[PDB]
Amino acid sequence: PKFVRLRGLPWSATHKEILDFLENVNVTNGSAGIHLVTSNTGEAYVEVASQEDVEEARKLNKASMGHRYIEVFTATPKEAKEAM
Amino acid sequence: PKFVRLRGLPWSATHKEILDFLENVNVTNGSAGIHLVTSRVDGKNTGEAYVEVASQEDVEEARKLNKASMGHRYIEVFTATPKEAKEAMR
């Protein structure tokens, strides 16, 4: 299982908005693959289907979502589990 | 008097934080040249500001900060007329 981590999300970010930001990425189980980190911190862990999906998500590093630039990182399964 | 308009600021932004974003711009009277726009609907700051700058070259330099970042936000920078600045603060 493959994960990316988004950082810099607006307070208002929804799963649907994240899925659309990641439109060209195959997100595992769609909206159900998106996990917002709460304290809502601006981070999310997203399960993606394949290595090429990790690479494509990473191409969105510093792409815009609304009026913000979103950082995109890889994440390990251990990181995603610990954060949720 | 010459103005630029910033859009996309944190609505909690301070004058000092805006002056630092504009550190390489000569802002007229420093912090006193920064005018935060307040909503006529809810009375809270909107994330826009009108900033008086000393010269044409300062307008150009402020405009180079268009789409520069403040944290994760990017800030849009426009020129503004005195009439626009006056109307926003009326």
From the candidates A5, A60, A68, A71, which should be mutated to test the interface with B, based on the most B CB atoms within 10 A?
A68
Please choose, from the candidates A47, A55, A48, A45, the residue with its C-alpha nearest in 3D space to the C-alpha of residue A9: A45
List of chain A residues whose C-beta atoms are within 8 Å of the C-beta of residue B76: 67
Give start and end residues of each alpha helix (H) in A2-76: 15-21, 51-59
Q: Is the dihedral of CA A67, B86, B30, B14 positive or negative?
A: negative
Instruction: Provide the CATH number for the domain formed by A1-84 in this structure.
Output: 3.30.70.330
CA distance A44 to B16: 31
CA distance A68 to B74: 5
CA distance A53 to B62: 38
Contacting B residues, span 43-62, partner chain A, CB-CB under 8 Å: none
CA distance B60 to B64: 6
CA distance A46 to B2: 46
Question: Residue B28, Cβ neighbours under 10 Å: how many?
Answer: 16
Contact B28, B37 (CB under 8 A): no
Is A68 at the interface with chain B, CB within 8 A? yes
Is A7 at the interface with chain B, CB within 8 A? yes
Is B11 at the interface with chain A, CB within 8 A? no
DSSP label at residue A6 = E
Resolution in Å equals: 1.5
Query: What is the b/e burial string over A46-76, where b = at least 16 CB atoms within 10 angstroms of the residue's CB?
Result: bbbeeeebbebbeebeeeebeebbbbbbebe
Number of Cβ pairs < 8 A linking chain A and chain B? 18
Locate the domains of chain A by residue range: 1-84
Question: Residue A33, Cβ neighbours under 10 Å: how many?
Answer: 21
Query: Which of the following CATH numbers is that of domain B1-90: 3.40.50.300, 3.30.300.30, 3.90.220.20, 3.30.70.330?
Result: 3.30.70.330
Residue B80 distance to chain A (closest CA, Å):
20
Rg (CA), chain A: 11
